[PDB]
Design a binder for this molecule. Structure first.
Ligand SMILES: O=P(O)(O)O[C@@H]1[C@H](O)[C@H](O)[C@@H](OP(=O)(O)O)[C@H](OP(=O)(O)O)[C@H]1O
Lengths: 247, 582
């Protein structure tokens, strides 16, 4: 449960100076199309030794390396993968849970939780598109639970990395001065609504319940005043949530 | 360009989503907001006095915080009070010693509101009123650990441990909250066009504009933004600006008192403005610098215009014209271009048309018997006898005048609302609260929860009563009394529970009227001029009876003139109706 800064540093430098042989990113249009085709062919699942698994493992390794609130590795990790490609791949109509998890983790550990301020994050619509996709995934989970049939992988994605990224974005010192919050009130409101519905389900575990409660509390705290008001129908349960949190 | 020093008074301009200066609402309200529509850097707002802040160094509040916590053991309490007093004295000594030291990036500084004399602080145990996710910032008279605010560069050119230069954007981070101040776009419902300021992560930057320098802030030298009185030696009279017959006019008011120095009125207060290259820079006036005169109440500036003497002195609404410009020729020798010392004889000269100010005995209000307003024209030549002496003014007078002006503004708004035939419940509550504060101010008694309707004042404050009379606050009270009836409210219907808050409002108004005429002949006569309307409300539970009785019994002449068979008959009828000993 500890991070070795030196190991992360050497891994990052070795990966960068090794070349395209070790690190492969489908950032090109043709490469993006090939990734889309292989992902569509992998609708049933991801093979153990398929190139998609290798790409997911590489993205996870880069995200883990960038972890630890450092500056040496995080800048290089962000440079390797820009936000535009993450939005293009994650926001595509057709996608898979593993790739979404990997990219969301990469964004959380290399963009949201950066040790050094970066202007390109909190002054763009990339993360707001990401948040609308998060709301869509939450709605998908709710609809699936409506029919009593749901995919565990999607639930895990919505519960583990989605909530962590939402909390990090709305709990970082550098995000307190977001300039596009006022123009993007609806989306955040939607997020809150989605979270509320996710908390309304009974199957949520105690640890998951606590994590969702913390995320809702952070969203409400950031949503106190932004030239916005809580809808009364939505506020009906937010009042109970606040009462429970105060207790 | 110059470096920033401790004690300098500078203006903060918000940069980001909303651009504007930091201002404070009216009354004793501690809320801080930003009004982009009020003005900008090119065109500062008219009420610029509310956008001035003074920089102060670190202040220790450990003993004060401990004493406050303990209060919220008599010997222990006394020891804590003594420790707090010693800490305050030590902090004052440190501020005096460290005065004038350069400000370095990354240091801790505090902002003090000169107009309100309250330190800005960020409360870490409560959220903002509007933006719940944000954090509240408020002005505190004594301050606390929240006053501490680290200053950091906004650009990459500067770094920690570097001098701060004027006209540069900086970030203020509270020591406790640790969140840059943000000018939230959330508009204030109470006041349209006002944006609340809170503490939350953002990219807003506060530009620093220098207005008054620690070296030039010496009280011994006249400085821009300071209010004084101009006195004429030969005439032994004071210059003033007043609305004679609906139009503002400037005149040398005559006094029948045996002591000219005691003939001081709030409306006769004048402020000195210095002209500099930067419109927001006042500095300290030099003997070779242009000067302007401003009215502390009406806001108009002194000027000279073609006299229907060739030019007569009048008041203009804006100082954006060379007419308002004036120069002070010293009567005696001066130390080259040294700063003008306070309370020094000077001669006013109008440089716009190259004419010299003078005084004449021709009244401006000849229409009224025994005129008091006197004309002040200009002469092409210079006269040594036309010398005006400067007199200092205590801060208490400025605070009282500002409070009176704000209260008069809200009372005029309330009168307008009442005349419209519809007043909101929130507006009625605000009016009632304002009348409550006015009652407390007239009574000069601390607000300790005692029934203000029965408030008791041992010694009336003559200055406060004169301020109320001259500022037309009593006229506003009379208008409030007369507006609902003129309808909105009826005297016979006051018994109904619906108009109970209106009844309490009339109650507070009558208390105000009674408390402003305690052993003061001028106020007594001013109120008695409305004897007819006061008697029109006789009998009803409004306590017009007690006010009328006190006012008329205090003065023999008023009782002789006003009381007649009709008043006695009304009193007999009402006592028969009620049969009460009162
Ligand atoms: O001593 P008394 O009998 O009250 O008379 C005072 C004085 O003689 C004037 O009537 C008046 O001054 P001005 O003529 O200059 O107005 C002043 O009121 P003021 O305080 O409003 O000036 C009075 O208080």
């Amino acid at each position: 449960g500890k991070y070795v800064k030196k190991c992360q540093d050497m891994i990052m430098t070795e990966l960068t100076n090794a070349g395209d042989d070790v690190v492969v990113f489908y950032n090109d249009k043709a490469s993006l199309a090939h990734l889309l085709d292989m992902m569509k062919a992998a609708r049933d699942g991801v093979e153990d030794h398929s190139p998609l698994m290798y790409h997911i493992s590489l993205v996870d390794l880069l995200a883990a390396c960038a972890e630890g609130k450092n500056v040496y590795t995080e800048i290089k990790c962000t440079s390797l993968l820009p936000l535009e490609d993450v939005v293009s791949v994650v926001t595509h109509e057709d996608c898979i849970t593993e790739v979404k998890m990997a990219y969301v983790n990469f964004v959380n550990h290399c963009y949201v939780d950066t040790e050094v301020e970066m202007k390109e994050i909190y002054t763009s619509n990339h993360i707001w598109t990401l948040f609308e996709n998060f709301t869509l995934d939450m709605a998908r989970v709710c609809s699936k639970r409506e029919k009593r049939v749901a995919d565990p992988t999607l639930e895990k994605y919505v519960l583990s990395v989605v909530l962590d990224t939402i909390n990090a974005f709305f709990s970082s010192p550098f995000s307190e001065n977001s300039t596009s919050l006022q123009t993007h009130q609806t989306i955040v409101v939607q997020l809150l609504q989605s979270t509320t519905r996710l908390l309304e389900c009974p199957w949520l575990q105690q640890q998951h319940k606590g994590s969702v409660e913390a995320c809702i509390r952070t969203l409400a705290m950031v949503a106190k005043g932004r030239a916005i008001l809580l809808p009364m129908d939505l506020d009906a349960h937010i009042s109970s949530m606040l009462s429970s949190g105060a207790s | 360009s110059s470096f920033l020093h401790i004690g300098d008074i500078v203006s903060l301009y918000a940069e980001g989503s909303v651009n504007g200066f930091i201002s404070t609402l009216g009354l004793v309200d501690d809320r801080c907001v930003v009004e982009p529509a009020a003005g900008d850097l090119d065109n500062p707002p008219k009420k610029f006095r509310d956008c001035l802040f003074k920089v102060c160094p670190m202040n220790r509040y450990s003993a004060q915080k401990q004493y406050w916590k303990a209060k919220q053991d008599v010997v222990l309490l006394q020891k804590l009070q003594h420790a707090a007093q010693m800490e305050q004295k030590q902090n004052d000594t440190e501020n005096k010693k460290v005065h004038g030291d350069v400000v370095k990036y990354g240091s801790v500084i505090q902002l003090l509101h000169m107009k309100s004399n309250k330190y800005l602080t960020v409360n870490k145990r409560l959220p903002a009123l509007l933006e719940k996710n944000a954090m509240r910032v408020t002005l505190d008279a004594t301050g606390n650990e929240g006053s501490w605010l680290f200053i950091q560069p906004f650009w990459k050119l500067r770094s920690n441990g570097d001098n701060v230069v004027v006209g540069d954007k900086v970030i203020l981070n509270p020591v406790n909250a640790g969140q840059p101040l943000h000018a939230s776009n959330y508009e204030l419902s109470d006041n349209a066009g006002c944006k609340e300021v809170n503490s939350v992560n953002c990219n807003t930057s506060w530009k620093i504009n220098l207005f008054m320098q620690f070296r030039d802030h010496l009280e011994e030298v006249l400085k821009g933004g300071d209010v004084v009185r101009l006195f004429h030696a030969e005439q032994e009279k004071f210059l003033t600006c007043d609305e004679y017959k609906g139009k503002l006019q400037v005149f040398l008011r005559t006094t029948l008192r045996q002591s000219a120095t005691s003939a001081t009125s709030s409306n006769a207060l004048w402020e000195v403005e210095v002209v500099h290259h930067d419109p927001c820079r006042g500095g300290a006036g030099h003997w070779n610098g242009l000067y302007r005169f401003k009215h502390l109440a009406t806001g108009n500036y002194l000027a000279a215009e073609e006299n229907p003497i060739k030019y007569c002195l009048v008041a203009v609404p804006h100082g954006n014209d060379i007419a308002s410009l004036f120069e002070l020729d010293p009567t005696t020798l001066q130390k080259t271009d040294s700063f003008v010392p306070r309370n020094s004889y000077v001669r006013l000269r109008h440089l716009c048309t190259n004419t010299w100010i003078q005084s004449t005995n021709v009244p401006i209000d000849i229409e009224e018997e025994r005129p008091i307003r006197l004309m002040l024209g200009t002469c092409p030549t210079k006269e040594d006898k036309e010398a005006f002496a400067i007199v200092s003014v205590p801060v208490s007078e400025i605070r009282d005048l500002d409070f009176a002006n704000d209260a008069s503004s809200m009372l005029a708004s309330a009168v307008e609302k009442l005349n419209e035939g519809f007043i909101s419940q929130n507006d009625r509550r605000f009016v009632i609260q304002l009348l409550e504060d006015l009652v407390f101010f007239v009574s000069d008694v601390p607000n300790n929860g005692q029934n203000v309707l029965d408030i008791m004042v041992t010694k009336p404050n003559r200055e406060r009563q004169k301020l109320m009379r001259e500022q037309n606050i009593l006229k506003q009270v009379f208008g409030i009394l007369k507006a609902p009836f003129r309808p909105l409210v009826r005297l016979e219907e006051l018994s109904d529970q619906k108009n109970a808050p209106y009844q309490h409002m009339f109650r507070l108004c009558y208390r105000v009227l009674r408390h402003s005429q305690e052993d003061y002949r001028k106020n007594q006569e001013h109120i008695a001029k409305q004897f007819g309307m006061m008697q029109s409300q006789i009998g009803y539970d409004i306590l017009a009876e007690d006010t009328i009785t006190a006012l008329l019994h205090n003065n023999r002449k008023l009782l002789e003139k006003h009381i007649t068979k009709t008043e006695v008959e009304t009193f007999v009828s009402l006592v028969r109706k009620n049969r009460e000993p009162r």
